[PDB]
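Repro case for the chain-ordering regression, as requested:
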Amino acid sequence: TTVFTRILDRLLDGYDNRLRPGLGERVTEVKTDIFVTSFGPVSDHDMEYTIDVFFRQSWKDERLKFKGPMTVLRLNNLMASKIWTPDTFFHNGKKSVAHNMTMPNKLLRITEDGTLLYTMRLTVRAECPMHLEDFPMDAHACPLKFGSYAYTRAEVVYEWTREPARSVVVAEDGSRLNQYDLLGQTVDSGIVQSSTGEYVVMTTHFHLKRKIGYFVIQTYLPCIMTVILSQVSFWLNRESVPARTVFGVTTVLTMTTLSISARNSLPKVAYATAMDWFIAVCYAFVFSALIEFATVNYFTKRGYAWDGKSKTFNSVSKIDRLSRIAFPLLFGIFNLVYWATYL
Amino acid sequence: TTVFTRILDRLLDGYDNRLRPGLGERVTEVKTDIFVTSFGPVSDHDMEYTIDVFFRQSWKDERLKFKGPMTVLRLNNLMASKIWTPDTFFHNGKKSVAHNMTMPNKLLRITEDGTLLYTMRLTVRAECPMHLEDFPMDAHACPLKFGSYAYTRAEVVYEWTREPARSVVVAEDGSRLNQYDLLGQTVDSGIVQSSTGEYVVMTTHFHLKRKIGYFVIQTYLPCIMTVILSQVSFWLNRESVPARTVFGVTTVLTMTTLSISARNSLPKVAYATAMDWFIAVCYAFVFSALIEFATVNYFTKRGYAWDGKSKTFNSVSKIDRLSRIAFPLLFGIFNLVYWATYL
Amino acid sequence: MSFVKETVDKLLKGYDIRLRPDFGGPPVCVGMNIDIASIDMVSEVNMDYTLTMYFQQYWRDKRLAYSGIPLNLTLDNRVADQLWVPDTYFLNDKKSFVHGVTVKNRMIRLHPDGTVLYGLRITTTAACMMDLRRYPLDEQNCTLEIESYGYTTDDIEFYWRGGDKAVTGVERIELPQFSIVEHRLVSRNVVFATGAYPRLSLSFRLKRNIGYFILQTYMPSILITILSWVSFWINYDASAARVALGITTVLTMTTINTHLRETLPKIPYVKAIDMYLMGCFVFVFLALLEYAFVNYIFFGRDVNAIDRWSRIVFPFTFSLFNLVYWLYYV
Amino acid sequence: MSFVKETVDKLLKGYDIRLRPDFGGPPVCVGMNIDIASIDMVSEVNMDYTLTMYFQQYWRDKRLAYSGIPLNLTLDNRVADQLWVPDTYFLNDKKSFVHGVTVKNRMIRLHPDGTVLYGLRITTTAACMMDLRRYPLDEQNCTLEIESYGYTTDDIEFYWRGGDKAVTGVERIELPQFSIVEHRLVSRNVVFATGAYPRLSLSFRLKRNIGYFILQTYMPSILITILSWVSFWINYDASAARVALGITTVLTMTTINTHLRETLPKIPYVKAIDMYLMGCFVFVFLALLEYAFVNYIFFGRDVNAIDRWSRIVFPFTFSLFNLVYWLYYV
Amino acid sequence: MSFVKETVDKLLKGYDIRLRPDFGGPPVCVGMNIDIASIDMVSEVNMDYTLTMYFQQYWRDKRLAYSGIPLNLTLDNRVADQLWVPDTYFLNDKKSFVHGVTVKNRMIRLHPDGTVLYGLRITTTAACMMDLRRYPLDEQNCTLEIESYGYTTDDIEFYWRGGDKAVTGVERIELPQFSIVEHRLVSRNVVFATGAYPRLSLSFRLKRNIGYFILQTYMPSILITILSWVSFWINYDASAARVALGITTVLTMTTINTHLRETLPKIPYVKAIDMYLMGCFVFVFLALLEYAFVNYIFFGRDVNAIDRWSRIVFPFTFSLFNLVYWLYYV
Ligand SMILES: *[C@@H]1O[C@H](CO)[C@@H](O[C@@H]2O[C@H](CO)[C@@H](O[C@@H]3O[C@H](CO[C@H]4O[C@H](CO)[C@@H](O)[C@H](O)[C@@H]4O)[C@@H](O)[C@H](O[C@H]4O[C@H](CO)[C@@H](O)[C@H](O)[C@@H]4O)[C@@H]3O)[C@H](O)[C@H]2NC(C)=O)[C@H](O)[C@H]1NC(C)=O
Ligand SMILES: *[C@@H]1O[C@H](CO)[C@@H](O[C@@H]2O[C@H](CO)[C@@H](O[C@@H]3O[C@H](CO[C@H]4O[C@H](CO)[C@@H](O)[C@H](O)[C@@H]4O)[C@@H](O)[C@H](O[C@H]4O[C@H](CO)[C@@H](O)[C@H](O)[C@@H]4O)[C@@H]3O)[C@H](O)[C@H]2NC(C)=O)[C@H](O)[C@H]1NC(C)=O
Ligand SMILES: *[C@@H]1O[C@H](CO)[C@@H](O[C@@H]2O[C@H](CO)[C@@H](O[C@@H]3O[C@H](CO[C@H]4O[C@H](CO)[C@@H](O)[C@H](O)[C@@H]4O)[C@@H](O)[C@H](O[C@H]4O[C@H](CO)[C@@H](O)[C@H](O)[C@@H]4O)[C@@H]3O)[C@H](O)[C@H]2NC(C)=O)[C@H](O)[C@H]1NC(C)=O
Ligand SMILES: *[C@@H]1O[C@H](CO)[C@@H](O[C@@H]2O[C@H](CO)[C@@H](O[C@@H]3O[C@H](CO[C@H]4O[C@H](CO)[C@@H](O)[C@H](O)[C@@H]4O)[C@@H](O)[C@H](O[C@H]4O[C@H](CO)[C@@H](O)[C@H](O)[C@@H]4O)[C@@H]3O)[C@H](O)[C@H]2NC(C)=O)[C@H](O)[C@H]1NC(C)=O
Ligand SMILES: CCCCCCCC(=O)OC[C@H](COP(=O)(O)O[C@@H]1[C@H](O)[C@H](O)[C@@H](OP(=O)(O)O)[C@H](OP(=O)(O)O)[C@H]1O)OC(=O)CCCCCCC
Ligand SMILES: CCCCCCCC(=O)OC[C@H](COP(=O)(O)O[C@@H]1[C@H](O)[C@H](O)[C@@H](OP(=O)(O)O)[C@H](OP(=O)(O)O)[C@H]1O)OC(=O)CCCCCCC
Ligand SMILES: *[C@@H]1O[C@H](CO)[C@@H](O[C@@H]2O[C@H](CO)[C@@H](O)[C@H](O)[C@H]2NC(C)=O)[C@H](O)[C@H]1NC(C)=O
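-- result from build under test --
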């Protein structure tokens, strides 16, 4: 241990951690890869997603070459803070967490050649701008961009450790998504210009597709059943005015309850989503069913119904007879057009 | 002030704050007392409570004797962290705050004899398991246990400064309870054995009694007034089928709304409480009233009511005549049995 | 590399961080520019907004001048603790922080002449007192006040670096509920009991998106109001039908108002949404109250005339209410 | 700058932050003044309010006296961690912090005679026990208690620096739900078992704005109660119409009451809002009972008299109930 | 205490925290045991549970061996920062902290042979993926994964100290909503790109309690379904009574689902609770639709047969549905 201890104390001798490797001499190349331990929940209201990663950074520092029995050293959490490391940050990050339980969730290794492997465990909240026009039948590409906050591309450049497709790895038990499926990802890199210069940006897009089953049982089925229930009024006799008025008016209140609740889960956007049109059309159908009876009642002549053993009686309305076909047919047609358009 | 300054430096001369007083020589005796500035809110959902205290600990450290013009010294918050203090913690604490605004809310006083008075202002959330079977007419004794985390009773022993009853003091304006009354307190001490050794535990129990006026006006009265309303149906004529069906059915919906909301405040416990049984009985009374009319209507013959002038007419149902007495009486009896049991 | 290391050591050797540049001399001029990364939340309930920005400060410190190195020295952000930095703060912020993953998002860049570039990535919740009389047809003006905490104008002066181009990224901002109509840069002095202080203000003008409220708030109220007029076309003798329609729409209007009213804090003054919702509530209230006169004036003592006129007056009066409302608020 | 640098280093060399000024001598007098920035929130559920202020402490320390410089040294905020400062805390403070962006919102200003001015920008959530019996027509008195933690009046004394002008910015406070009616300064000594501690108290009296509850709570309840009287003008034989009206008003009243239960706290006693809603609930309950008595007295056994009598007594008694309510609370 | 002070200072003189025990030698064996204090919360919405525990770690460090003192030296918890401790972390923990009142809830106890006892009091919110298809009749398996962040099995090895007796306090855990059925200890070596890492897993099997759901979910749904059958006993000509009964039960059923829509999570697939509510919704939908068929056959185009047969089939088929549901899920 004493022989080993001397090497460590010698390494940082005259070492300035405020200066990047090869300062004023060359560009510091950082090789990076990510292992997503759990792709956390996605929040539509906040337009953000959580992601738990093992953020691995690798680079070379000639000042940290060493010779000894071992060819790889696993440094302590304290050592990593004594040396220069890249100031990587996430461009679209909102509020990230570096885990400090029980100790700092970091690891720094050094090979004899001076190659540093540096890993940390992070929970990142990131911005994912969502265009929710096709909601809840929408797909999104949530990005994850990172780079050096302070060092321009003339000083620090980032790269992927291996092929870009094989550089972002998701754990098999990593999907922590309740309402989405992680179809895959695309890995890219580029350049971004800002007021302070040009910087290398490493980007990753996670392609997500929303699960629709929640909205079918919560929104679509009750709305469909409410529309069906509004049409069931067409099969009641025209003389039961209080019954068909209660039937139609209470179906309207059910649509209003359903329509308001569906939006409250949505973020406060100002355009019509896919679910908005379906609810609007269902609202029109239930609205038109009560207007239809208003017309039927306006032409009813006798307040009494057929007595079952025949004094004249009202005939069955021609408005009702046609509505028993037109309303189910138009709604059926609207569903084929709606579901084919978005699926 | 120079003479005073020198004494301070000499005190911590060779002082090892890693070693308790009398280590390997005797047992450190810490005398504790608590002044409750405010007994914070109690959370039935989380089964915890908040308490704001002045936590005073007193012990003797012969290493901190001194001689000078004064006989008592008040030490700044920086000095307290430089010496050895008991590693006291709260066994049932969930998340506690040691206030640090504007400065650390600590105080270390040293007497020339070597006695140290050490006070700190704390906000403590503590676990208070509750048996809610008598809810909302339930009473609880919320505990507050503390002791040394690392030192066994062979090393550190805690005692109350004065008579255990008088060692815990609650400020007159210290009651920060909305739905409870702090009846009183019992102060005890004992030994708790764990995997690491035997430890001394100081325990304080606060006896709480739930205020019922909230649930009487939010839950009990609406339930009682809805049950009365369901019985008002008995006094309508048996020929008004739509009115008595609307009357009975909407009281069922009112019971459903009341039952759902009353249990939302309650923690998700799987047993029946005193409010559940009252609501279940009110549900059965409202359900039975609508079943009563269903039986009355089955024996109704003529669809027209009494014309008001005199052709035969229905007679007042004998079921109705009896139900006008049995239902109010049975509910009245149930209330006396229910309230006398729990009050 | 050691030559650069020796240079940096010399600058901080004997460096006094408690003294501003040119202490006792002319005030140090600090220039600021901002790159706005995003505006995340704009909440009426809390009357604030969230702002993620890149915040840069420029000033000249002769103590940090260096020669012989033909490069700008970008240094590890931990060197900022060893330098004098302006005591800049956001006068109207409620809660703010500097991001710290993977490291603190802080930048220190030196220049040969002594110029210091101090950049931070900050998410700040800033107080924006909103005027909600015309809500949701309202236009807001939210500011960000940048002031020195301890130093007066005798010691430190602020200016926007680059004039009206000192703030960038505003055009790229997308808000789910607002549009950035304009932004302005102001520079002035504020006088307190302890002396005058330099102030920089950045302000935005926000116009709210009305399309969303039409589907959520206005449309359901409009349809229920039209529904309440269905009562005027039903026979006077259908008491059960007309009361059931009348009382259930009054219930529906309360339902509409309740589950919407939780979208706004307890702000006690009249707003545009309140007037429209209460205008429709009064109409459905009158449609059910209108039948009380109809039923009584037949059975208690012409009947079709009152309903016939209501079939015109109610649609007409509601259109008159809509015309006056939209013109007044647009 | 070197002269001032050595002047400051002279002061701290040999300084003992662990000892108060004039330790063992007369108590150190600390003057205090507060500049209130805003009262962000006042919550009845948690029974506390959030306050932003500039909190200033002013005392004299002979150990910090400097000569030769005819200027008041404004130093970096980090020098505050190397001096003695009072152990001031807020007694009823639940959670608080000093703002830290871009730097710690803290100020130190020295004067030649050893006088120290120490300012902090603090956001604090302070506990305020509220008496909500007259809610929403209630008037609250929320205080801030300022005390020394571990010094007695034999060591430290507090006073309001500037008399009744020691607190400014009250006119800046813009609470949407309240209006600041008055504020007071109190100086007193608090005696505990550990000794007597100097105490300063700043208290505000708040009067709640009632307009929101008139439109949101009282007016809907008044209109529903009026709507329940429409039953009195319908035929005694319209059982379905009159029961549906009466029972739906009861359901509507419960809806108002039940949804009000979530925003309001768990305060288990009768308040002003409860008495109005319970008054209106009893009136609509009795209207439903009124028809039941009419229906029973006809079919079970006059009929038109009861409706005629109810058309007058119910509106009249409700007006009397309102008159007694508003006089007793306004 | 003089001799003890020398011994303690001797151990830490030249101590290198950066190097593990037997660095570059055989792997250090770290024994662990846990004493669970409480499982505070288990939330389906956040898909996590909260666990408070006493977390002990045992390892031998010859650098910390001491002789001449026949005592086990418990030292102030702050000495832990001066010693080497394992880089242990919880792989699936979302938010966690060490309690810190009055001091850090941490323990270091040395032994003469060099054995180190290192104990912490940790409250950790750990991620637990839940399969809620059988909710509320579901059984869950939540785990806690313990791993070394940096070292490999060539450096550090984990084991449960005391075998199956390593974890204690499970039998005393009381949960308002669950019951601990079993717990297991697993030792394994997880493999990543970096290399093999030691792993210990503590897992509990939770079987949800049903009493709350019976009274809150199943019972209201059952009673409403039975109430819908009341329509079968009313005359076919009573259209206003049977439709109002039928449609209000449909409205009531949606009220249950919508109010339990906000307490339940956003997990988009068919669960056991959904099937029972959907089944009951179909039965009440069919009861209302049954009368539509009765009305059409009589008035549009025998009649008493449909009602008489409905009075048996509907109660019978609901019983059959219940039998299948409960047998399948119990
Ligand atoms: C009352 O108690 C509160 C906490 O409840 C204290 O706030 C803490 O104050 C200390 C001292 O200033 C802080 O410790 C310092 O942290 C710096 C980094 O902080 C940044 O990063 C952390 C995360 O790592 C963030 O949480 C934080 O917001 C910042 O973004 C370090 O750089 C400091 O180290 C420097 O100074 C020390 C001084 O001893 C040197 O030894 C170092 O070498 C170095 O120069 C330091 O560690 C702590 O972070 C604060 N906590 C929080 C939550 O903000 C108050 O200070 C305290 N009040 C009083 C009067 O004591
Ligand atoms: C949101 O709302 C805020 C107010 O709360 C608006 O802020 C105001 O913006 C106006 C400009 O639109 C400001 O008015 C301008 O102030 C400048 C600075 O004044 C200081 O310095 C001058 C000397 O240069 C001193 O005399 C003065 O006392 C101050 O110390 C002036 O330079 C401007 O002058 C311009 O107009 C005059 C004529 O009035 C011309 O003679 C000049 O040449 C020049 O064109 C001008 O007066 C105002 O000060 C701001 N108020 C505050 C409180 O900051 C935001 O604009 C608004 N946001 C949006 C998007 O509309
Ligand atoms: C919210 O509610 C709080 C109480 O909970 C109110 O605070 C009280 O305010 C009153 C004033 O309105 C205070 O009464 C005054 O106290 C002063 C301080 O008393 C201490 O110091 C004196 C010596 O100076 C000691 O004798 C005494 O024992 C205390 O230690 C007194 O100096 C004042 O005296 C003045 O009036 C008396 C007559 O009453 C005269 O004889 C005197 O000459 C002098 O003019 C006075 O007694 C009271 O102490 C406060 N209580 C607390 C607990 O702070 C807030 O005012 C209220 N908020 C609002 C907006 O109203
Ligand atoms: C919640 O769900 C988790 C899974 O998600 C369950 O965890 C599994 O538990 C089972 C035991 O119930 C584990 O199976 C056991 O694994 C041990 C470790 O395997 C490692 O080491 C061996 C070599 O020794 C390697 O081959 C292997 O790849 C691993 O690296 C084995 O030692 C066990 O074998 C022992 O028992 C079997 C009989 O069961 C004998 O035949 C053997 O001879 C030997 O005595 C066994 O295979 C499984 O590994 C766990 N999985 C995970 C992912 O941890 C939890 O049990 C469950 N919770 C509850 C309460 O049930
Ligand atoms: C939103 C739809 C608005 C439609 C508005 C439609 C407005 C409109 O034109 O109404 C008049 C009529 C009403 O039809 P309906 O059959 O209900 O009314 C019959 C009609 O009035 C006959 O003339 C009456 O016989 P008579 O000669 O008096 O002896 C008969 O009396 P009775 O013998 O039964 O007692 C009435 O019942 O409807 C149509 O012609 C459209 C049918 C297709 C409508 C298709 C709609 C899609
Ligand atoms: C839960 C209830 C279960 C009830 C189960 C079923 C209980 C049961 O048997 O009900 C029917 C019976 C009579 O019911 P009810 O009086 O309402 O019905 C009258 C009865 O049918 C007469 O026989 C009829 O006269 P008639 O002779 O035909 O000319 C009369 O017609 P009309 O003269 O008006 O034209 C009908 O109105 O009620 C009891 O015995 C109540 C016992 C106490 C019940 C106490 C219940 C608490
Ligand atoms: C220091 O701790 C060790 C370990 O707990 C103690 O050794 C125990 O001694 C008791 C004596 O009755 C035995 O029954 C146990 O089996 C021992 N444990 C082990 C792991 O060997 C030791 O006694 C402690 N030292 C002192 C002075 O109490």
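Ordering looks correct now. Helices of chain A lie at 2-11, 77-80, 213-231, 241-265, 274-298, 318-342.
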